[PDB]
DNA sequence: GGGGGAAGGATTC
DNA sequence: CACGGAATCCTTCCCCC
């Protein structure tokens, strides 16, 4: 099998360089202002020149402001980046069928057919590489491999913008030097459960009785690793359908009154069923983010679709269970609808 | 001992 | 101090073969 992976390089904030060229060279930080006070809010992402002094996804807007003081800060613009998504995303169907969208900037492309080795691959790559950065200005990074995982693993070694192939015989010698860590799907929680069973290694994973690994990570992530170490893993690349839709946004202050909170989870109902764009769903969840960070939500299914005014009214009720059934403050709230008919 | 759903939470990218 | 969106799992609970 022969899986092919691209990965548009620091994306939100290329785009904003594509939409406005004079912003190259220059450190970029796309950020979310949740309007809490001056520049309070967070970093979606920033490009290479504001990466290497630690400014990154996830770090606050004021403490990189403290680091980048002059840096170019733009506010995240979601439906855009979609779009120019979706443009690139069109352009790798002309590749090939088998194509799995995994998220706004990651695609898997299956070639095992239009292919039969890694050097009448890595031509095929470039021939994207260089035809992507051509129609629509942006750049991007591809890995090769055996399957997804590797694919996936090649990608994250040749970034920003670049190509790596990893064939059968290095997947191999992986298998037994990498970092577990470095394995797509294992965070920080799931990287520390292992250190503590003495897996180190994705061959490490065959030194374990599965049931007591089966106990520390689930089964499902345990097969999952397995599977890996066994150089048995070949996981099909089928186009995964939107499931669920939602928005969560954040207050000003954090509060516990249902008549303060309402308006924001209204705000929230609206655009959801915008973006709804003629789905009907039905189930509806409320979730909530306490004032220690924990998310808390409360939700119900219903038989029907959900009109709504019906989400409105719905929307309310498992607010209150949240405010009852919890006594934290609330920072951030939004609604989720899932089940479509 | 299941199937099978639903609900609330964990964890990853 | 840390936004935002969605997917896959897990555990528990429930009704009832
Ligand atoms: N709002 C928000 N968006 C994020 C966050 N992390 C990632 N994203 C989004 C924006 C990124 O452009 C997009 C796709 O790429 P990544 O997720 O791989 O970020 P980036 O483009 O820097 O990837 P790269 O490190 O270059 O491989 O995901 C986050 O913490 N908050
Ligand atoms: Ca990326
Ligand atoms: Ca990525
Ligand atoms: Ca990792």
Known sequence: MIVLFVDFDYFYAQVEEVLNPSL???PVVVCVFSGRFEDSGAVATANYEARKFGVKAGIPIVEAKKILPNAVYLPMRKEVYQQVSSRIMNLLREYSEKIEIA???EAYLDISDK?????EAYNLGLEIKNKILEKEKITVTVGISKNKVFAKIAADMAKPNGIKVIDDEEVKRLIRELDIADVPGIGNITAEKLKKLGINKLVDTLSIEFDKLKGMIGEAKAKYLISLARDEYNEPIRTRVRKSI???????????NLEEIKPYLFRAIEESYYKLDKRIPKAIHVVAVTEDLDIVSRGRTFPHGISKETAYSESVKLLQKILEEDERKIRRIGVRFSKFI
Do not use: F, H, P, Q
Not at 115 to 119: A, E, K, T
């Open 24 to 26: 190259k060279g220059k």
């Open 103 to 105: 998220s706004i900037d």
């Open 115 to 119: 292919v039969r080795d890694y050097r």
């Open 246 to 256: 939602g928005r969560i946004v954040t207050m000003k202050r954090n509060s516990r």
